Coordinates of N, CA, C and O and ligand atoms in Angstrom, one line a residue:
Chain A
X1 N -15.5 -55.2 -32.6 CA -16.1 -55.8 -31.4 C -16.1 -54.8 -30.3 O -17.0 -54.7 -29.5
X2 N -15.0 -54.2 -30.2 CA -14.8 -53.2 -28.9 C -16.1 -51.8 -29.1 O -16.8 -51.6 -28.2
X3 N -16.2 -51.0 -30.4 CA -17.1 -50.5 -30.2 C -18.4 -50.8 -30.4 O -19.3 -49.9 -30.3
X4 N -18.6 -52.5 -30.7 CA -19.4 -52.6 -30.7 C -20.4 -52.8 -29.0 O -21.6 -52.6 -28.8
X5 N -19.7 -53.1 -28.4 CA -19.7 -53.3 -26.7 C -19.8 -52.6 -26.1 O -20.3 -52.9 -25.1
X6 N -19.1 -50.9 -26.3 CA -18.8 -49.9 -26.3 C -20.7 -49.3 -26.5 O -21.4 -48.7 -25.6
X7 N -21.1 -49.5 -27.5 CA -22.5 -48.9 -27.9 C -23.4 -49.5 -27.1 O -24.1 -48.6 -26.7
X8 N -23.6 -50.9 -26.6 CA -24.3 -51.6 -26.2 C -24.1 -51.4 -24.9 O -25.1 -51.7 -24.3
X9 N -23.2 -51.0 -24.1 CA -23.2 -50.8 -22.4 C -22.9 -49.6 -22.5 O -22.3 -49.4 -21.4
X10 N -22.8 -48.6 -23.1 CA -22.8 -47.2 -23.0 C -24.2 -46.2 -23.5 O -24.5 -46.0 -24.7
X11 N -24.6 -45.7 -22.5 CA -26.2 -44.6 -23.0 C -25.8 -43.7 -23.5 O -26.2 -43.6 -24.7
X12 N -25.0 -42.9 -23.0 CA -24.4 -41.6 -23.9 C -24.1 -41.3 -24.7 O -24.0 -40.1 -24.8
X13 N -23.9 -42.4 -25.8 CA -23.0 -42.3 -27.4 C -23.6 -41.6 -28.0 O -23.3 -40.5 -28.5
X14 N -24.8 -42.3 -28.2 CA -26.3 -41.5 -28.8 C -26.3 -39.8 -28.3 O -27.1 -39.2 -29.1
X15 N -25.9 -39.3 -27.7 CA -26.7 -38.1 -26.8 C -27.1 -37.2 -27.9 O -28.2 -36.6 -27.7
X16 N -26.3 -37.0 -29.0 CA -26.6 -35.5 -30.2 C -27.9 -36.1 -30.5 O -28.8 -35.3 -30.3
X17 N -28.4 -37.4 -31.0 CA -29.7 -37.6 -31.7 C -30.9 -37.4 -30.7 O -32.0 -37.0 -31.0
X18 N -30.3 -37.8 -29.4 CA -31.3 -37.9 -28.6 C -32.1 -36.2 -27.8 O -33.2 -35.7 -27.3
X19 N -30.8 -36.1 -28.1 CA -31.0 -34.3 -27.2 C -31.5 -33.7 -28.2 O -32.4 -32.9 -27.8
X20 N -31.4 -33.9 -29.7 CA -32.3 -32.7 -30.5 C -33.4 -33.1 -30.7 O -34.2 -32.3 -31.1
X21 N -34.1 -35.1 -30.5 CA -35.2 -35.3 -30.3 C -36.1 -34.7 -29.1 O -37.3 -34.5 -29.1
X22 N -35.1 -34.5 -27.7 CA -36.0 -34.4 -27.0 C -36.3 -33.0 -27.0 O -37.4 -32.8 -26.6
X23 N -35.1 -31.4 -27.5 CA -35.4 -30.6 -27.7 C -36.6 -30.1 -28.8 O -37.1 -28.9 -28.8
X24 N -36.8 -30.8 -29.4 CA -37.9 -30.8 -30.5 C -39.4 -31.0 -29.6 O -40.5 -30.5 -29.8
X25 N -39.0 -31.7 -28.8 CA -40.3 -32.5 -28.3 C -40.8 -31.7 -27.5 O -42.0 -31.4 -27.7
X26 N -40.1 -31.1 -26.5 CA -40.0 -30.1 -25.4 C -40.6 -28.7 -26.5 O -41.5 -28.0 -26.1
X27 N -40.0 -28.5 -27.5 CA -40.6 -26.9 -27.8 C -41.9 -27.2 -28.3 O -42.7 -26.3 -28.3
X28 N -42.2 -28.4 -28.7 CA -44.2 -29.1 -29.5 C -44.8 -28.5 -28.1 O -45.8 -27.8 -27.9
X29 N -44.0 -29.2 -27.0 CA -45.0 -29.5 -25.5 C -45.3 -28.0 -25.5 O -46.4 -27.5 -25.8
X30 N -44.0 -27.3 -25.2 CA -44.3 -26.0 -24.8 C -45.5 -25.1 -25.5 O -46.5 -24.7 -24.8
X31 N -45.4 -24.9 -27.0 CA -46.3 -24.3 -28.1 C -48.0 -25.2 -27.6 O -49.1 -24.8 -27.5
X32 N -47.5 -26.2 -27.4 CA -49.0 -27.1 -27.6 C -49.6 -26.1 -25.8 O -50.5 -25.4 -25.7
X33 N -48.5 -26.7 -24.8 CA -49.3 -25.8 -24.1 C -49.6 -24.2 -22.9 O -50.1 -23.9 -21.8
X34 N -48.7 -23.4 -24.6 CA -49.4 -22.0 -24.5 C -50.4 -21.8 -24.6 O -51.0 -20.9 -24.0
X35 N -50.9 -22.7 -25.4 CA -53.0 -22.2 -25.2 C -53.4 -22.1 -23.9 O -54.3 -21.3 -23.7
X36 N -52.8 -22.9 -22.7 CA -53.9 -22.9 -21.4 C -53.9 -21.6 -21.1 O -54.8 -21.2 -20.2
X37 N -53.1 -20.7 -21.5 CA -52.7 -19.1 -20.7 C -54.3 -18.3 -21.1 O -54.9 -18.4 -22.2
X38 N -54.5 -18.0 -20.6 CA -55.6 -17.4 -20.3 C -55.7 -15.8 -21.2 O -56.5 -15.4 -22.1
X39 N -54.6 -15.3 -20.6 CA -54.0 -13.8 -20.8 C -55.1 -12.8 -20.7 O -55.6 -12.3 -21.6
X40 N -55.5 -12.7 -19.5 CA -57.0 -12.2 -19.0 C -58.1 -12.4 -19.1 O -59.0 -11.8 -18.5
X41 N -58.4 -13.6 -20.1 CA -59.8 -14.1 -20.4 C -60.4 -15.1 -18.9 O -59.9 -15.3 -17.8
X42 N -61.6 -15.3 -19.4 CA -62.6 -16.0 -18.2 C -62.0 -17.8 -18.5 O -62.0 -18.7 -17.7
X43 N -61.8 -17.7 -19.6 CA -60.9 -19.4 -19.8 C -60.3 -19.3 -21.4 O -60.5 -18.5 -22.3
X44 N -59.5 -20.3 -21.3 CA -58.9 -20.1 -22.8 C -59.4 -21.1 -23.9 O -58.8 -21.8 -24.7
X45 N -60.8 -21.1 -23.5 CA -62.2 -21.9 -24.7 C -62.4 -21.1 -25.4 O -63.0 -20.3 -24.6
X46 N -62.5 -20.5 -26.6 CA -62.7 -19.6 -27.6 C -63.9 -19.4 -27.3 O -64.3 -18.3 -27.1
X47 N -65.1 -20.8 -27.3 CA -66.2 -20.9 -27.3 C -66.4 -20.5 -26.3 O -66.6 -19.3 -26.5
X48 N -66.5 -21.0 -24.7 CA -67.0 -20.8 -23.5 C -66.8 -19.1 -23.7 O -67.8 -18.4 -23.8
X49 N -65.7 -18.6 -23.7 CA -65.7 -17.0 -23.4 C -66.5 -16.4 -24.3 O -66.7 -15.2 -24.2
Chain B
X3 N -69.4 -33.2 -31.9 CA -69.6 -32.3 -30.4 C -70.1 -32.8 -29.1 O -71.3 -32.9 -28.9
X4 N -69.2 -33.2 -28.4 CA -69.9 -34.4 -27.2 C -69.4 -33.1 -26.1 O -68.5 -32.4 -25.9
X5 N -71.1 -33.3 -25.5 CA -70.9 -32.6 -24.2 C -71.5 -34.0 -22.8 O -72.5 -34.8 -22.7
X6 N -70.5 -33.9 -22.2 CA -70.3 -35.1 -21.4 C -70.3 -34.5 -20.2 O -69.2 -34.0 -19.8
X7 N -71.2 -34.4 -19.5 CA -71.2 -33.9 -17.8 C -70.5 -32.1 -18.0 O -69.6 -31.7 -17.4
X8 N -70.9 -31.6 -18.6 CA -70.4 -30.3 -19.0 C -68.8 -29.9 -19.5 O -68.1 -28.9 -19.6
X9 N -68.8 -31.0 -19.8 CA -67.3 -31.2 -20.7 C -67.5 -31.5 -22.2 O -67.9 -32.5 -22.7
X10 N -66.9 -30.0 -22.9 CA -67.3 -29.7 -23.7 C -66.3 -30.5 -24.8 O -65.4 -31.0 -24.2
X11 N -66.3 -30.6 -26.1 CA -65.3 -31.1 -26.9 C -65.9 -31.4 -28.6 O -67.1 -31.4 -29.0
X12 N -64.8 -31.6 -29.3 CA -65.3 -32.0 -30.2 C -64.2 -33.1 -31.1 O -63.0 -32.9 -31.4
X13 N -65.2 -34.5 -31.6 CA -63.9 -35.5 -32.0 C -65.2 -36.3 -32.5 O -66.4 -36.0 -32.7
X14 N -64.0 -38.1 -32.5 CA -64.7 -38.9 -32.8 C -64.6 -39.5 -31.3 O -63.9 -39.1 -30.4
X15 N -65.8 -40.4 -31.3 CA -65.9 -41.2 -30.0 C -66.0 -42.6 -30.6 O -66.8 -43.0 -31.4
X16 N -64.7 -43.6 -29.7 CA -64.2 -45.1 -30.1 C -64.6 -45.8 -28.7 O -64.3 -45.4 -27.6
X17 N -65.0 -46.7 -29.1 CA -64.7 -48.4 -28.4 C -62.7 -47.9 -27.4 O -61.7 -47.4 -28.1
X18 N -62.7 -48.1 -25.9 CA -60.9 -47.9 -25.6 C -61.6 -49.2 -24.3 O -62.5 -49.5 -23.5
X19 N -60.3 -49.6 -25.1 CA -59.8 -50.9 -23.7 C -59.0 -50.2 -22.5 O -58.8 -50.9 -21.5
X20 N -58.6 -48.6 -22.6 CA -58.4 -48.1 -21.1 C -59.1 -48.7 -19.7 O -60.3 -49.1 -19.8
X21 N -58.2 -48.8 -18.3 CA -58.6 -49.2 -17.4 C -59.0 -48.3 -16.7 O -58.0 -47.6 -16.5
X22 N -60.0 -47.6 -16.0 CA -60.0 -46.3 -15.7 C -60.6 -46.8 -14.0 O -61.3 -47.8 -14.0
X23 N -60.4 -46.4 -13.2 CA -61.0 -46.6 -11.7 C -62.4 -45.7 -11.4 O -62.8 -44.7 -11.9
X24 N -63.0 -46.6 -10.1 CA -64.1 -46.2 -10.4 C -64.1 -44.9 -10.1 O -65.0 -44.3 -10.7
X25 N -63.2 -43.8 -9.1 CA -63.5 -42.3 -9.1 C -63.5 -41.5 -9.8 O -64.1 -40.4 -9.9
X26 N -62.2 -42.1 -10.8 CA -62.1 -41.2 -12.2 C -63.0 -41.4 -13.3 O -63.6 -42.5 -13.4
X27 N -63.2 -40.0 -14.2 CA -64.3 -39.6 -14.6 C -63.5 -39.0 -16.3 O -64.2 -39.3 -17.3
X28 N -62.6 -38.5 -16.4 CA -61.7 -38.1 -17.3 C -60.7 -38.7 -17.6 O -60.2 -39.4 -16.7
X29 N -60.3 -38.7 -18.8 CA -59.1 -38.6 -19.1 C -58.2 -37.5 -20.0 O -58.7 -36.8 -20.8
X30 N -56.2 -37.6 -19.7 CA -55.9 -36.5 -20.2 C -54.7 -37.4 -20.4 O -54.6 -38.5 -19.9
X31 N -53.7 -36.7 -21.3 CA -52.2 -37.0 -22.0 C -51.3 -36.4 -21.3 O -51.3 -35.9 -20.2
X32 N -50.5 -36.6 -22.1 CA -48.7 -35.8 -21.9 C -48.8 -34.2 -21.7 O -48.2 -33.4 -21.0
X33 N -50.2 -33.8 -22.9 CA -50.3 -32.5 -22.8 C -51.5 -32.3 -22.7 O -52.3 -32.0 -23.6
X34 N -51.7 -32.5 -21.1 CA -52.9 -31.9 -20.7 C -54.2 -31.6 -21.5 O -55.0 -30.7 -21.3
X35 N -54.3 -32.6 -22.4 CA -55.5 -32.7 -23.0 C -56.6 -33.3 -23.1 O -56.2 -34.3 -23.6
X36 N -57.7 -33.4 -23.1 CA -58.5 -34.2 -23.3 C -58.5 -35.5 -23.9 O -58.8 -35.3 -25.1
X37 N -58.1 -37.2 -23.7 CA -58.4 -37.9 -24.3 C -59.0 -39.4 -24.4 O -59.0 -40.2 -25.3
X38 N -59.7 -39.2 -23.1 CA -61.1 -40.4 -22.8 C -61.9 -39.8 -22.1 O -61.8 -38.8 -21.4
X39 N -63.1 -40.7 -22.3 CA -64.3 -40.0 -21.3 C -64.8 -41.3 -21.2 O -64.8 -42.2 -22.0
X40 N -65.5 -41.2 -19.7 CA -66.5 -42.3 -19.3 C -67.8 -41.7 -19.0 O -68.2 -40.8 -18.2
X41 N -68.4 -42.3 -20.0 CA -69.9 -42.1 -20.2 C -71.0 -42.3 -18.8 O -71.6 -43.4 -18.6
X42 N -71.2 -40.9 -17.8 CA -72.2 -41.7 -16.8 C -73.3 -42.4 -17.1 O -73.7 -43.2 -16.3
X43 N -73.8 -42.4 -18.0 CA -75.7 -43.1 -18.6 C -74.8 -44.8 -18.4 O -75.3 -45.5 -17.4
X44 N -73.6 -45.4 -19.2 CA -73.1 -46.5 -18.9 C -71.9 -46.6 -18.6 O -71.1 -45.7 -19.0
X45 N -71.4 -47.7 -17.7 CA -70.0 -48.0 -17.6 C -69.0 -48.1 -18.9 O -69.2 -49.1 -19.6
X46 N -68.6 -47.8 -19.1 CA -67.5 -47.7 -20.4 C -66.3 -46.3 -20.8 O -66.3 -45.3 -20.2
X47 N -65.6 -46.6 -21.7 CA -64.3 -45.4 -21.9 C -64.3 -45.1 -23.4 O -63.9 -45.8 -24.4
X48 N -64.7 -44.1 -23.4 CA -64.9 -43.3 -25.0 C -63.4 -42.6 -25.0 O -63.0 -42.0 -24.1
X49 N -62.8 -42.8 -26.5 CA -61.6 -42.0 -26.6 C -62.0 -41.1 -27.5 O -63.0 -41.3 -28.2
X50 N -61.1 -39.9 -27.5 CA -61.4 -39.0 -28.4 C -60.2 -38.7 -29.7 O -59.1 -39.3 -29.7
X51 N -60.5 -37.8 -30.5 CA -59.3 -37.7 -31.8 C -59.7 -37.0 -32.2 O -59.2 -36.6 -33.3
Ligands
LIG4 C1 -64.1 -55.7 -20.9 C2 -65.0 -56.8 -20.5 O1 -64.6 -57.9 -20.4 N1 -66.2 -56.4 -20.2 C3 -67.2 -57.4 -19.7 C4 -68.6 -57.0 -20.2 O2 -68.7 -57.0 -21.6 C5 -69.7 -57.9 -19.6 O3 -71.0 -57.5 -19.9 C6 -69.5 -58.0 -18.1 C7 -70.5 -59.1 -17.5 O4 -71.5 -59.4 -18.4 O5 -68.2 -58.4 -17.7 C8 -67.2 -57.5 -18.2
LIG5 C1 -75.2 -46.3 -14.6 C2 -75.8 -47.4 -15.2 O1 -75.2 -48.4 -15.5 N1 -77.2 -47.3 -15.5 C3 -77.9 -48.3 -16.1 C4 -79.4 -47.8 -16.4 O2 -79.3 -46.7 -17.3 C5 -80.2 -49.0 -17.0 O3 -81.6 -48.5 -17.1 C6 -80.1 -50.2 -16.1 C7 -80.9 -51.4 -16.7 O4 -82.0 -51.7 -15.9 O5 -78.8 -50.6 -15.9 C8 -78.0 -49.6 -15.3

């Protein structure tokens, strides 16, 4: 009962699952958005340039 | 390939129950992407995928 009360009014317990969910999520965001970079083009539209 | 007011793209276009206001003209995600459009010819919100 105690850790069960313990899990239920505590956020933190969780942290290892949560932190490598969100570090996963964080490196998709990042990769997803390297494309806006330009890196000297007129836009980073394959097409439009 | 929907070109929508010179916004270029390419998907499917759906039926979205999004609420969109009348100044806004786009929509975008988590990651800066493209993912509704309101059609000027009619009032309505096209999603994309
Ligand atoms: C989402 C929704 O309810 N849209 C309706 C639309 O279908 C209807 O044409 C209009 C008045 O006719 O009122 C609004
Ligand atoms: C922005 C918009 O809603 N435009 C339409 C127009 O295309 C249509 O001809 C008219 C019906 O008479 O209703 C309105």
């Amino acid at each position: 009962g105690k850790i069960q009360d313990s899990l239920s009014s505590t956020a933190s317990a969780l942290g290892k699952l949560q932190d490598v969910v969100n570090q996963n999520a964080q490196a998709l965001n990042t990769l997803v958005k390297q494309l806006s970079s330009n890196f000297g083009a007129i836009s980073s539209v394959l097409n439009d340039i | 390939n929907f070109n929508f007011n010179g916004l270029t793209g390419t998907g499917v276009l759906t039926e979205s129950n999004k609420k969109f206001l009348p100044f806004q003209q786009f929509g975008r995600d988590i990651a800066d992407t493209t993912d509704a459009v309101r059609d000027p010819q009619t009032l309505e919100i096209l999603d994309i995928t």
